[PDB]
């Protein structure tokens, strides 16, 4: 199956998921110069106050923290989106070394690791029927820069000895995600997919200007997880990131 290895990585996943040459993949890279600024864009609503998280689990290609998503307790709207999206979890990709881990790119550059928080369209009714839909899912993008440590990640960065492998998963309930974001909610938006397999086109990509910064132990800690489930080879889970794909028919907007 898909991964991220010599033999099943990005440059692979087409010949399963044709949809990996589609009009609208992502991640892209941003050229900030080309990105234009859209007067039309409302403000960004990020209401995460009565977020319940419930789990964290390491499948296999990244670890998500999940959430309970069957009533509105923490959603994201405004900005380019129309309606209310609910989160469903959130996970991160990164890299081997500090020069590489992110998805998308700005100016070409890559920064350490990626956040991505995904939300789903209340009016779709659940996720399974919102990645069907081509404004199903609204996810926030947060780059991850080493430098000081990020108070607010440490306690996923505690719980990763408790899912080393793939298919474990642990208790994770009361983590607030609002201590993942940055001070500015300046963002670039623009029509993309999921950036892992089916890599569905569904997504309103919504990527902040400013990156979060986490300490070099913490993104250490990610990399010391696995791919791999318990009893098999050791591959460490690193380098779990797709480059950036072609622009093709889209504008990057900016809400700055
Ligand atoms: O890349 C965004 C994404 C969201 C949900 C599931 C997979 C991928
Ligand atoms: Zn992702």
């Not at 080309?34 to 106050?49: M, R």
């Not at 070099?216 to 696995?226: A, D, M, T």
């Amino acid at each position: 199956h898909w991964g991220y290895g010599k033999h099943n990585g990005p440059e692979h996943w087409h010949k399963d998921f044709p949809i990996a040459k589609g009009e609208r993949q992502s991640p892209v890279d941003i050229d900030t110069h080309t990105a234009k600024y859209d007067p039309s864009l409302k403000p960004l609503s990020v209401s995460y106050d009565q977020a319940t998280s419930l789990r964290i689990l390491n499948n296999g290609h990244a670890f998500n923290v999940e959430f309970d998503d069957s009533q509105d307790k923490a959603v994201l709207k405004g900005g380019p989106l129309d309606g209310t999206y609910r989160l469903i979890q959130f996970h991160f990709h990164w890299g081997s070394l500090d020069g590489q881990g992110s998805e998308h790119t700005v100016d070409k550059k890559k920064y350490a690791a990626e956040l991505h928080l995904v939300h789903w369209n209340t009016k779709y009714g659940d996720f399974g029927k919102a990645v069907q839909q081509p404004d199903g899912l609204a996810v926030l993008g947060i780059f991850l820069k080493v430098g000081s440590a990020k108070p607010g990640l440490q306690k996923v960065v505690d719980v990763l000895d408790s899912i080393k492998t793939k298919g474990k998963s642990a208790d994770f309930t009361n983590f607030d995600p609002r201590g993942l974001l940055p001070e500015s909610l300046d963002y670039w938006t623009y029509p993309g997919s999921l950036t892992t397999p089916p890599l569905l086109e569904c997504v309103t990509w919504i990527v902040l200007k400013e990156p979060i910064s986490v300490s070099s132990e913490q993104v250490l800690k990610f990399r010391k997880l696995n791919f791999n489930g318990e009893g098999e080879p050791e591959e460490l889970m690193v380098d779990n990131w797709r480059p950036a794909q072609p622009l093709k028919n889209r504008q990057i907007k900016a809400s700055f």
